[PDB]
Amino acid sequence: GHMRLLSEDLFKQSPKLSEQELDELANNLADYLFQAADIDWHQVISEKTRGLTTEEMAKSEHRYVQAFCREILKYPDSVIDVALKRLQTGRERLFTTTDEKGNRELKKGDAILESAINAARMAISTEEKNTILSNNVKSATFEVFCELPCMDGFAEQNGKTAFYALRAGFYSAFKNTDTAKQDITKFMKDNLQAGFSGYSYQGLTNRVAQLEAQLAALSA
Amino acid sequence: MRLLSEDLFKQSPKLSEQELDELANNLADYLFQAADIDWHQVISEKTRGLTTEEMAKSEHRYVQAFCREILKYPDCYKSVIDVALKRLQTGRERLFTTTDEKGNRELKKGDAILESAINAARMAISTEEKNTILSNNVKSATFEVFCELPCMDGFAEQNGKTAFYALRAGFYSAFKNTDTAKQDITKFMKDNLQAGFSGYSYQGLTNRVAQLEAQLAALS
């Protein structure tokens, strides 16, 4: 199943999982983690395009440069920086638009580039992403992880300190980018299987209970 | 000293046992002084009635004082004593009654300013008495004065909601019923200052775990 979007029980029934779909769940939760990771596109597109021309960027691939540059369509327009700035200016409706089988012209408008950015996000192979990231993979991949449903309130249930422990155990999770994926999966698996206990606060409370009951019944 | 923004918790261990006890003690004392007394949770107390001659006798000094102060107006018929009460919060600004002794007065209303009556009650009260008047409502009040200390400042933000709650509960349970209460809390205080505060603290639950592991492996 594709639900890592399980609001909580992701961290609940994982404990609690036979090695099969635990190794599975960890693996493709990792795959999801990369696949979702934001690339901060503006530098990326500018550095891939330039110094080319409107018709000639639409020529290449690089699927994503194309997917993004299907937005030369709104109106006329290296010169992509121009596009960016000259667009994000207003949230209102100004820039003209094309007509295919019939006129839809004064429309977005402020596309928020969810149009173009999203298009790109759709058109980029994930590996290209891994390479293009190169150790910013840490903050980005972790940053998808943080907005997961399962991770929804962690910061305020467990506190700042527990949350930082988790970030740091995540960055320390993989070195170097070479094995990045294989690394992260590991971490996911090991946290999914038991836990997440501390970094959980309850996990810790329980850990201490059980841990002093086995320094208790040690009688022997 | 109290009011130490951070230090108190971190630097309380280790003060010499005499200094620790001085802190635990003067601390209980503060919690009890600063306790917000919140009258009108006292109205339904022995005003149920009527409830007429109370103000006459009113064994406990606070009712004697308070009432013998609030009896100088018409008492507000035609909606027990409750009717009259309402006329003085929303009475703003009615400017009504209080005939002396002689005539006039005209009046303080105000609705007027009960604050004279509550000044009466609170000046007519001791702190031990306060302990008495609270009655299992002591827990909450004394706690929400304890969170007003500088050391408690960001406690739920660093350690999270769950720990804040465990801390509360642990505090509330610090005392079985009223008899020994001032002592119990003191013991609890001393108890949590000597060591820690460890969990409830996040960091302390961690060290506590790793140390119970170091005792595990240190022996076995």
Report chain A's C-alpha Rg in angstroms. 23
The residue of chain A nearest to residue B159, with distances taken between CA atoms, is A159
Contacts of A207 in chain B (CB under 8 A): 205, 209
- Say yes or no: B66 and B32 in one domain: no
Measured between CA atoms, how close is B56 to chain A, in angstroms? 53
Nearest CA to B184 out of B174, B196, B195 is that of: B174
- Say which DSSP state B16 is in: -
Count of domains forming chain A: 2
- Based on the domain organization, do A132 and A191 belong to the same domain? yes
Q: What angle do CA B150, B156, B161 make, to 5 degrees?
A: 160
Q: Which residues in chain B (79-98) have CB-CB distances under 8 A to chain A?
A: none
Which of A88, A107, A123 delimits the end of a domain?
A123
Distance CA A95, CA B68 (A): 78
Nearest CB among A158, A207, A208 relative to B160 is that of A158
Nearest CB neighbour to A208, from listed B159, B203, B205: B205
Judge if B134 and B61 occupy the same domain. no
User: How far apart are alpha carbons B158 and B151 in whole angstroms?
Assistant: 12
Return the residues preceding each gap in chain A, C–N over 2.5 A, or none.
77
Residues A131 and A22 in one domain: yes
Among A105, A123, A141, give the residue marking a domain's end: A123
- Helix residue spans in B34-154 (DSSP H): 61-70, 82-86, 115-123, 127-134, 138-146
Alpha-carbon distance A26 to A5, whole Å?
13
* Final residue of a structural domain among B108, B124, B140: B124
Q: Do both B50 and B129 map to the same domain?
A: no
Per the CB < 8 Å rule, is B199 touching A205? yes
Which residues of chain B neighbour A205 with C-beta distances below 8 Å? 166, 199, 205
Using CA atoms, how far apart are residues A99 and B172, in angstroms rounded to an integer?
71
A116 and A135 within one domain: no
State whether A81 and A51 are in the same domain.
yes
Q: Cis bond leading into B186, ω under 30°?
A: no
Whether omega for the bond prior to residue B14 falls within 30 degrees of 0, making it cis, is yes
Instruction: With CB atoms and an 8 Å threshold, state whether A211 touches B215.
Output: no
Say whether both A133 and A208 belong to one domain.
yes
In a shared domain, residues B102 and B150: no
Residue type, B30: Y
- CATH code, domain carrying A20: 1.20.120.1210
* Domain encompassing residue B115: 39-124
Alpha-carbon distance A142 to B188, whole Å? Answer: 41
CATH of the domain at B118: 1.10.720.170
Backbone angles phi, psi at A3, to 5 degrees: -90, 100
Would the CA dihedral through B134, B135, B138, B140 be positive or negative? Answer: negative
Experimental technique for the deposited model: X-ray
Identify whether residues A107 and A128 lie together within a single domain: no
**Do A107 and A148 sit in the same domain of this protein?**
no
Listed in sequence order, the residues at least 6 apart from A134 whose beta carbon sits closer than 8 Å to its beta carbon are A177
How far is A167 from chain B, CA to nearest CA, in Å? Answer: 15
| CA dist list (Å): A212 to A157, B19, B136 | 24, 31, 33
Please indicate, yes or no, whether residues A51 and A112 belong to a single structural domain of this protein: yes
Q: Is the dihedral of CA A12, A18, A20, A26 positive or negative?
A: positive
Nearest to B13 by CA among B207, B203, B191: B191
